[PDB]
Amino acid sequence: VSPKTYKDADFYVAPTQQDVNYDLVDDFGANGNDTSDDSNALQRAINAISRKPNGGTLLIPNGTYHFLGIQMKSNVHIRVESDVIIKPTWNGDGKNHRLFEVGVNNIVRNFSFQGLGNGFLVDFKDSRDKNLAVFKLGDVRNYKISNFTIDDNKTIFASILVDVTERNGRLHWSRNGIIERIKQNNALFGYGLIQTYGADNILFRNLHSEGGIALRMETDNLLMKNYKQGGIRNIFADNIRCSKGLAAVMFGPHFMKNGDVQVTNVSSVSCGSAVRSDSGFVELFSGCAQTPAARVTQKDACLDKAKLEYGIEPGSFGTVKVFDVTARFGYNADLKQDQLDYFSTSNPMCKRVCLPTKEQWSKQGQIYIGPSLAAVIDTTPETSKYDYDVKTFNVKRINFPVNSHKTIDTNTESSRVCNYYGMSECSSSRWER
Ligand SMILES: [Ca+2]
Ligand SMILES: [Ca+2]
Ligand SMILES: [Ca+2]
Ligand SMILES: [Cl-]
Ligand code: NA
Ligand code: NA
Ligand code: NA
C-alpha cells in the first residue's frame, strides 16, 4: 500500500487578515528579565486580542517568562522569539498544572502558538512542580502548535494532552489541528511528548521525545469511559521519533473504540521498539478475571460475557497503517518488566540491563533501562474477535545483535533470564541521562 496524501490546509487554516499585532512586554508589561510571574500580562494580552473581531498576533519577545494556567482564546495567534525561555510559575496547591490550557474551560476556534526561527525553550529543569503539562487541549478547533523544545525533568504527564472536557452534559475535544516540530528532553518513562484521548483530524509531525513515548495514542481517560464518548479518528502522523525511551509511536486503546490512523516515517534510537501496539482490554470496578480494579482475561469466551453483562468491550483502532519504520539499536532504552523475558534469545545473561534505585524511582519494577528489544512490538490478540491491526510497512533495524527480535508478537517465545529485583542498579548518570 501507499500512504494517503494530505495538505496542511486539510488540518489548519491560518488567518488571512487580523486586527492587531501586540507585544507581550511593550503592550502588556510582562517582564522577561526577572523571576516574577508573567501570567496576568499574558492573559490580559490574550483577552485583548480575542475581543477583536478578526483577532491578532501576540509576540512574546526574547526573555525568560513564568506562566501557569493560561487560558487561550479564539483568534489569538502567539509567536515566540527564538531565544525565549518559558518556565512554569510556582504554585504549591499540589494540583495538576499546565502552562497553557486551550478549550478546557471555554470554546476556542482559530488558534496558533508557534516559535519563530529554530524555536524556543520550555524549561522544567528548575521547577519544584512535578505535575506539569505544557498544553492541555479541550474544545479547540483549527489550531496549530509548533516549534519548541521542552527540557523536562521527568515530570508527571505528557507535555501535550490532546484531551476531552465536559460541558453541557457531554464531552468535547479538539478537531482540525497541527502539532509539530517539538523536541522533548528527559521525559519520564510513563509519559512523553503527546498523549491523545479525544481527537479528530489532527496532524502530528516532526515530534521527538527522549524518554517515554513521543506519540502515545493511549486513549484511557476515565471520562471517556463514563460518557462513552471520545477517542481519536482520522489522525495523521509523520516523522515521529524516540530516543532512550519506550517507543516513538504507541497504540493502546484500552476500552475505547478509535478510528483510523496513518503514520509515516517513524524512527527510534535506543528505544524499546519504534512502534508498539497494546491489546485493548476491559476493566471491572467494585479464568475471566485477572489479579486485581479487575482486568478481564483475554479470552473470547470471557469477553463475550463481558459485552453481555456490562456492555463494555476491549478498545480498538480502525484502519491503522505505519509506513517506513527504522529502529536503531541502543543500550539505554526504557523497558517494562514484562518485556525483559524477550532478552532470552539475544541476551541470555541479561547484560547491560539496570534497575533504577528507589531514590531514582520508588516503585521498583515499573521501569528498567537496557538494550533495545525490537523494531515493532504488537501484543494485540491475533486470534480473537476482539482485535485490531496495526499494519507496518518497510520496517528496518540497524545495529541489532544477532538473534534479536524484529517484531515481537503474541507468538514470540520468551523465558526469564533477568534478575527482576537483584540485577545491577542503574548509575545516576544513566538514569539522569
Ligand atoms: Ca517575569
Ligand atoms: Ca532558539
Ligand atoms: Ca492484531
Ligand atoms: Cl499524560
Ligand atoms: Na505595540
Ligand atoms: Na525581538
Ligand atoms: Na509532564
Curated annotation (Swiss-Prot):
Any GO BP: polysaccharide catabolic process
UniProt cross-references to InterPro entries, sorted A to Z: Pectin_lyas_fold, Pectin_lyase_fold/virulence, RHGA/B-epi-like_pectate_lyase
Record Pfam families: Pect-lyase_RHGA_epim (PF12708)
Protein source organism: Alteromonas macleodii (Pseudoalteromonas macleodii)
Domain of life: Bacteria
Keywords (A to Z) from UniProt: Carbohydrate metabolism, Cell wall biogenesis/degradation, Disulfide bond, Glycosidase, Hydrolase, Polysaccharide degradation, Secreted, Signal
CC terms in the record's Gene Ontology section: extracellular region
Gene3D superfamilies xrefs: Single-stranded right-handed beta-helix, Pectin lyase-like
Catalytic activity: Endohydrolysis of 1,4-beta-D-linkages between D-galactose 4-sulfate and 3,6-anhydro-D-galactose-2-sulfate in iota-carrageenans
Primary location class: secreted
Gene: cgiA
Gene Ontology molecular function: any one: iota-carrageenase activity
Name of the protein this chain belongs to: Iota-carrageenase
Primary role: Hydrolyzes iota-carrageenans, sulfated 1,3-alpha-1,4-beta galactans from red algal cell walls, with an inversion of anomeric configuration. Also active against hybrid iota-/nu-carrageenan, not active against kappa- or lambda-carrageenans.
Family, as annotated: Belongs to the glycosyl hydrolase 82 family.
Disulfide bridge map: 242-271, 288-302, 350-418, 354-426
UniProt key word Cell wall biogenesis/degradation: yes
Assigned EC number: 3.2.1.157
Location in the cell: Secreted
